[PDB]
Amino acid sequence: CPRFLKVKNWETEVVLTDTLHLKSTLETGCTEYICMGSIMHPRPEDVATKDQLFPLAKEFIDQYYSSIKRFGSKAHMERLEEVNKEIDTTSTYQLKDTELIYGAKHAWRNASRCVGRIQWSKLQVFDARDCTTAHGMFNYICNHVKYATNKGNLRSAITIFPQRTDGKHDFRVWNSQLIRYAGYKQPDGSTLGDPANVQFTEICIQQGWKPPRGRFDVLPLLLQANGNDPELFQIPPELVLEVPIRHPKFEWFKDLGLKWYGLPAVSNMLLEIGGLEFSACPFSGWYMGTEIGVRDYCDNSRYNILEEVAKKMNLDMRKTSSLWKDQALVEINIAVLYSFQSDKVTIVDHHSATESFIKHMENEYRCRGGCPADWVWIVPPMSGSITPVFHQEMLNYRLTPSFEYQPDPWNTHVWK
Amino acid sequence: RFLKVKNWETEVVLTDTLHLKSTLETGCTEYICMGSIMHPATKDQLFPLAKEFIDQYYSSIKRFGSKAHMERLEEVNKEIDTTSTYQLKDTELIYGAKHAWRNASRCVGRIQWSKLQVFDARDCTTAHGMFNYICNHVKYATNKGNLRSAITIFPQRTDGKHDFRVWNSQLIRYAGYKQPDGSTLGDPANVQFTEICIQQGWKPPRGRFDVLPLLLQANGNDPELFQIPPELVLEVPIRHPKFEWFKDLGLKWYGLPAVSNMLLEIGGLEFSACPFSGWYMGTEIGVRDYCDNSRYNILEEVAKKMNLDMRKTSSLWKDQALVEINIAVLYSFQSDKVTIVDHHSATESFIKHMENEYRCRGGCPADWVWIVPPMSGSITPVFHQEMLNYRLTPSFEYQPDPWNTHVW
Numbered sequence: 001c002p003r004f005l006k007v008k009n010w011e012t013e014v015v016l017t018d019t020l021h022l023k024s025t026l027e028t029g030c031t032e033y034i035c036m037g038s039i040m041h042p043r044p045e046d047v048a049t050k051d052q053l054f055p056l057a058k059e060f061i062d063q064y065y066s067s068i069k070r071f072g073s074k075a076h077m078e079r080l081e082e083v084n085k086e087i088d089t090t091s092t093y094q095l096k097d098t099e100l101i102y103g104a105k106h107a108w109r110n111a112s113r114c115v116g117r118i119q120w121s122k123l124q125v126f127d128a129r130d131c132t133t134a135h136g137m138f139n140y141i142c143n144h145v146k147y148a149t150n151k152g153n154l155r156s157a158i159t160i161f162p163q164r165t166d167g168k169h170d171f172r173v174w175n176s177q178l179i180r181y182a183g184y185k186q187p188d189g190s191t192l193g194d195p196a197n198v199q200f201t202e203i204c205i206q207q208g209w210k211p212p213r214g215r216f217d218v219l220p221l222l223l224q225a226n227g228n229d230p231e232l233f234q235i236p237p238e239l240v241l242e243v244p245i246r247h248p249k250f251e252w253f254k255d256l257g258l259k260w261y262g263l264p265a266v267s268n269m270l271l272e273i274g275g276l277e278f279s280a281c282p283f284s285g286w287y288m289g290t291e292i293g294v295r296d297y298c299d300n301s302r303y304n305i306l307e308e309v310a311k312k313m314n315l316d317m318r319k320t321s322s323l324w325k326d327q328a329l330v331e332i333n334i335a336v337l338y339s340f341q342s343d344k345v346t347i348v349d350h351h352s353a354t355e356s357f358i359k360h361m362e363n364e365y366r367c368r369g370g371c372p373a374d375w376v377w378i379v380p381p382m383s384g385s386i387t388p389v390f391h392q393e394m395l396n397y398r399l400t401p402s403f404e405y406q407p408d409p410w411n412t413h414v415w416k
Numbered sequence: 417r418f419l420k421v422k423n424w425e426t427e428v429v430l431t432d433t434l435h436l437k438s439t440l441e442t443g444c445t446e447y448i449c450m451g452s453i454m455h456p457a458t459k460d461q462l463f464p465l466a467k468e469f470i471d472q473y474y475s476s477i478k479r480f481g482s483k484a485h486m487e488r489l490e491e492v493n494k495e496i497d498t499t500s501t502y503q504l505k506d507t508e509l510i511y512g513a514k515h516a517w518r519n520a521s522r523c524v525g526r527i528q529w530s531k532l533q534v535f536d537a538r539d540c541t542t543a544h545g546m547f548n549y550i551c552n553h554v555k556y557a558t559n560k561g562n563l564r565s566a567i568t569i570f571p572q573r574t575d576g577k578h579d580f581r582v583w584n585s586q587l588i589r590y591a592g593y594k595q596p597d598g599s600t601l602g603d604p605a606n607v608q609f610t611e612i613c614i615q616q617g618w619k620p621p622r623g624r625f626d627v628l629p630l631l632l633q634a635n636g637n638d639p640e641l642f643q644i645p646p647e648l649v650l651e652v653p654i655r656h657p658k659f660e661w662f663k664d665l666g667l668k669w670y671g672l673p674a675v676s677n678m679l680l681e682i683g684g685l686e687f688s689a690c691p692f693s694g695w696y697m698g699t700e701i702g703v704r705d706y707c708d709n710s711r712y713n714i715l716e717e718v719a720k721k722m723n724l725d726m727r728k729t730s731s732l733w734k735d736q737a738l739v740e741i742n743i744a745v746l747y748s749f750q751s752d753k754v755t756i757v758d759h760h761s762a763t764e765s766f767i768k769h770m771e772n773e774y775r776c777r778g779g780c781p782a783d784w785v786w787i788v789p790p791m792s793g794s795i796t797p798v799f800h801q802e803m804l805n806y807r808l809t810p811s812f813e814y815q816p817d818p819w820n821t822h823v824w
């Protein structure tokens with residue numbers, strides 16, 4: 001592979017030079033003959049062997065002591081020797097708190113699909129590696145939610161549960177996000193709530209959950225500690241900050257009865273650091289408007305409200321070339337930003353977030369020699385070309401530490 | 417491997433086998449994806465390429481290994497032997513042209529691929545001849561508003577020293593003028609080319625929408641200027657169906673979108689002059705030409721007339737202004753009976769086309785970055801459609817701008 005790769009911004013003519021790609025550790029899925037850049041997702045109870053683990057650990061440890069300007073130091077070599085000893089005797093090792101914090105911040109930093117990474121170094125890391133039970137997990141998660149929510153003044157946070165051992169003792173949050181609304185399939189084929197969540201909702205209901213059967217019912221947490229069967233907990237409602245959607249102009253918009261939750265928090269991903277696998281590592285930030293206004297509300301397979309809004313806007317909905325869909329999409333997204341700003345809950349519009357990302361990316365090319373980015377994910381789902389990211393060439397590659405996808409636990413769990 | 421692509425909205429899964437046919441590079445490797453990068457012979461090199469292309473043509477007409485097939489392979493060999501090149505049969509030219517379109521991964525309009533009027537211009541020898549051939553192209557494809565897809569193919573490359581090139585990147589473009597005060601009149605994107613035209617004798621009216629002349633190079637010679645007769649150039653004044661003040665913005669655009677800077681490769685042959693044209697998707701004009709910062713850049717003005725709050729970005733004034741501009745463009749072309757497709761219709765058709773291609777052909781190469789429209793992405797079906805990108809031949813490829821390679 002070539003040492004220097006160049007990306008261009010076609011709006012500004014600015015050209016950046018990437019050398020960081022050379023540190024690429026994993027596979028994109030693409031080859032020279034095919035590109036899989038728009039594929040969403042391109043192993044049994046299986047864990048890293050001693051020989052696989054040594055080099056991955058050294059790689060990470062080197063990188064860490066390089067970052068604190070102590071590469072090749074006595075404390076660097078001693079840490080190498082201590083880790084290598086731990087792998088030899090125990091087939092694994094434990095990260096120091098300093099290294100855990102570095103690794104988490106870097107996994108976010110390396111997350112090519114995140115437009116919010118300007119904030120990567122401000123991340124509160126809760127070390128939950130002493131957790132042993134589902135109730136314990138519940139406690140840690142509640143604390144995360146409250147801290148991150150901060151009464152509306154959101155703060156990004158991640159809570160890391162114990163790493164994987166033999167693969168039969170995994171900690172998992174079964175929820176894909178900490179806060180989601182339930183979906184219920186009706187006998188008639190209609191759906192109530194969020195149609196996307198019918199499967200998970202069914203699982204909950206089976207585990208003992210009593211469903212309110214509403215449009216915006218917060219799901220319980222389904223928590224798995226040390227490989228045991230998962231257990232249900234209801235998040236205390238006072239910890240779940242919500243925002244009712246209203247529009248600065250349309251008085252009738254509040255009559256749609258829409259609202260959304262303040263905190264975006266992903267909990268189905270796997271954090272890999274130095275070859276160690278943290279299968280439960282919920283992390284949370286704050287919303288970009290379009291996540292709600294466009295995808296949650298206007299995806300056909302989600303809440304699908306374009307039609308209903310278009311009707312209350314009295315738009316001609318017979319031709320598509322009237323662009324009634326597009327007009328209603330903008331208004332919805334205006335109401336979302338306005339409802340969040342009015343309740344003083346943190347939210348960033350897609351224009352501000354993308355400009356910030358460009359400034360971030362440029363800084364990263366300057367200080368780091370690169371910034372992996374997934375254009376398909378970074379460009380917002382509305383108004384794409386009037387945001388600066390659309391015109392920015394990006395290179396995508398996988399650096400470690402990283403957040404990775406993992407199988408859904410209900411497909412793999414062995415029931416006790 | 418066989419590869420699966422999934423649509424996340426319909427949960428439809430298609431199986432791609434066609435990608436196994438490709439050979440040219442994508443730019444990506446196992447470790448680095450360049451999916452968002454815009455730009456990533458000899459007797460011995462020529463024949464296998466020739467061979468393959470002939471092979472797939474006789475395969476496409478259900479006569480693989482026939483007597484016609486054999487003599488053709490023999491013919492091409494003897495001709496590459498003695499002349500260092502070969503000339504395509506008429507039927508091969510048309511097949512190659514339609515398939516270059518069919519294989520164009522960045523094109524959302526490909527459901528139309530087999531309906532393409534092919535103009536064989538391989539007997540052209542001078543710039544005047546090229547102009548005649550291009551005028552006929554424009555007129556046929558314009559067709560008084562009822563646009564029809566067309567391509568005009570000039571002589572193939574020989575030694576790279578006697579190339580045919582249309583120097584305009586598109587057959588119809590507006591000029592761009594660099595003002596003293598540092599502002600830019602017209603289309604800023606073409607400011608350079610415009611100046612090249614002036615430097616060669618073009619007399620600029622210096623307005624906001626002056627149609628550039630054609631600049632045409634035949635057989636490696638210095639290019640020559642020609643003005644397309646105005647009656648061949650169909651233009652549409654843009655107005656809004658509700659905002660009667662919109663016509664006062666004074667905007668117009670041309671009806672014929674016609675790419676002329678690309679290279680058409682068939683059977684190892686290179687057609688460096690092959691202007692091709694179709695009809696517009698509304699966003700091309702409404703979003704890119706008008707609203708790109710480096711283009712006509714009209715958002716702010718329109719936002720003024722719409723009386724929007726422009727102090728903070730979170731009012732989405734930019735987004736609002738954008739939708740109305742695109743409504744106007746669709747409304748104008750439609751009212752003037754000029755062919756145009758909206759991004760909802762064009763994207764639906766493309767998904768349908770993908771289905772067809774997987775069914776009959778075993779795949780459909782597609783560039784998600786280019787196919788998804790530049791506005792309202794996720795309320796179109798292609799946003800949710802996984803796509804595999806790969807390079808099939810015959811194809812349209814990029815080439816150097818001739819003004820960086822030509823000796824006068």
Ligand code: HEM
Nearest residue numbers: 108111113114115116119156157283284285286287288403
């Ligand atoms: C602080 C404000 C943040 C903003 C504005 C932000 C923005 C976004 C957005 C808009 C997406 C696309 C989400 C989707 O379409 O589902 C995304 C994805 C992602 N973000 Fe960020 N994010 C933030 C915080 C964080 C934090 C704190 C982390 C990790 C420590 C993180 C890591 C990721 C990852 C791994 C993805 C990929 C998700 C997936 O593959 O499903 N983000 N981000």
Ligand code: HEM
Nearest residue numbers: 517520522523524525528565566692693694695696697812
């Ligand atoms: C008939 C209706 C057609 C429609 C609606 C259509 C639509 C589009 C659009 C919207 C683009 C993106 C253009 C841009 O953003 O610059 C595009 C690109 C492209 N089209 Fe089509 N097109 C049509 C016909 C054709 C024809 C007739 C050909 C060739 C025979 C063709 C070949 C291509 C190629 C090679 C590109 C890539 C352009 C580039 O790389 O700059 N298209 N098309």
Ligand SMILES: CNCCN(C)c1cncc(CCc2cc(C)cc(N)n2)c1
Nearest residue numbers: 177264265266283284285286287288295
């Ligand atoms: C379109 N993506 C599907 C995921 N999805 C429906 C979803 C549901 N609920 C919450 C999120 C949040 C995604 C996210 C995560 C983080 C850390 C920040 C942020 N702004 N968004 C996503």
Ligand SMILES: CNCCN(C)c1cncc(CCc2cc(C)cc(N)n2)c1
Nearest residue numbers: 586673674675692693694695696697704
């Ligand atoms: C993003 N576009 C850059 C090129 N550009 C400004 C441009 C100028 N003039 C015309 C076109 C047309 C592109 C095109 C080509 C074809 C065959 C069909 C179509 N609908 N659009 C593009």
Ligand SMILES: C[C@H](O)[C@H](O)[C@H]1CNc2nc(N)[nH]c(=O)c2N1
Nearest residue numbers: 038039040376377799800801802
């Ligand atoms: C097929 C395509 O990869 C898929 O629809 C992607 C497109 N880009 C996206 N971008 C973001 N931010 N989130 C998404 O879920 C998706 N979905």
Ligand SMILES: C[C@H](O)[C@H](O)[C@H]1CNc2nc(N)[nH]c(=O)c2N1
Nearest residue numbers: 390391392393452453454785786
């Ligand atoms: C950087 C990026 O590749 C570039 O802006 C692309 C994105 N997608 C596009 N899509 C279309 N149709 N046309 C374009 O010019 C572009 N530009």
Ligand SMILES: [Cl-]
Nearest residue numbers: 116348353356
């Ligand atoms: Cl932000």
Ligand SMILES: [Cl-]
Nearest residue numbers: 525757762765
């Ligand atoms: Cl079409």
Ligand SMILES: [Zn+2]
Nearest residue numbers: 030035444449
């Ligand atoms: Zn790729």
